[PDB]
Amino acid sequence: RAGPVTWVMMIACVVVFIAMQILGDQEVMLWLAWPFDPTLKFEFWRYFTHALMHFSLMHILFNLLWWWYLGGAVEKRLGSGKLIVITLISALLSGYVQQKFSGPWFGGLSGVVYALMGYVWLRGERDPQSGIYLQRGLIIFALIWIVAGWFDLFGMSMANGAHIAGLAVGLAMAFVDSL
Amino acid sequence: RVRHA
Ligand SMILES: [Cl-]
């Protein structure tokens, strides 16, 4: 089963999603979005908590599925601490790149998921001895998912900066860890 | 409206 980090992230995302249905998306975004006014710049959690907000059922389900699988595997093979660091780095950097391109009104775990995809794949490719890899069918499924975001094949406005920065981060960390 | 990651 899912280890403690994999689990607490899933619980966190569900709690926030429930709060968003009860209070409305806008109210939760006031608390958890990337700082959108200079007065919020020291509210450190905001540089990460954008990753916990989801706006559609499809969005939360697919992100949590990928997180459960790829996060669960990273945590099992390489430890909880590794998953925590991938998560913090991808959330922070994906958010930074997103806000730079399109401003602070974004959310979702997909920056982190795209990091895990690139991480697990490249680490398996460059360092088979790690005991982690992305199997063929999931390479294809991950590629289609990526392609769909890039070419806007969901009926939703995408955080393309978050997604590409996420993937970059995962590939970069795999490269670093495979030395 | 909002962008989805
Ligand atoms: Cl499980």
Author numbering:
A (entry chain A): 92 to 270
B (entry chain B): 2 to 6
The authors write:
Rhomboid intramembrane proteases are evolutionarily conserved proteins with numerous important biological functions, including growth factor secretion, regulation of mitochondrial dynamics, and membrane protein quality control (Fleig et al., 2012). It is assumed that first a portion of the transmembrane domain of the substrate docks into an intramembrane interaction site of rhomboid within the plane of the lipid bilayer, upon which a linear segment of the substrate (possibly generated by local unfolding of the top of the substrate's transmembrane helix) interacts with the water-exposed active site (reviewed in Strisovsky, 2016a, Strisovsky, 2013).
To gain insight into these preferences and their possible interactions, we have generated tetra- and pentapeptidyl chloromethylketones (CMK or cmk henceforth) harboring amino acids preferred in positions P5 to P1 by the Escherichia coli rhomboid GlpG (GlpG henceforth), using the sequence background of the Providencia TatA (Stevenson et al., 2007), represented by the parent compound Ac-IATA-cmk. To provide mechanistic explanation for the observed increase in inhibitory potency, we determined the structures of GlpG in complex with Ac-RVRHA-cmk and Ac-VRHA-cmk. The side chain of Arg in the P5 position of Ac-RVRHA-cmk could not be modeled due to poor electron density, and the two structures are otherwise virtually identical; superposition of all corresponding Cα atoms yields a root-mean-square deviation of 0.19 Å per atom (using the SSM method as implemented in CCP4MG v2.10.4; Krissinel and Henrick, 2004, Mitchell et al., 1990). The interactions of the residues in the P4, P3, and P2 positions with the enzyme are structurally independent, explaining why the effects of substitutions in these positions are additive. The overall binding mode of both compounds into the rhomboid active site is similar to the binding mode of peptide aldehyde Ac-VRMA-cho (Cho et al., 2016). Collectively, these data show that rhomboid subsite preferences are additive in the context of an active site targeted inhibitor and that sequence optimization in this region can significantly increase the inhibitory potency of the compounds.
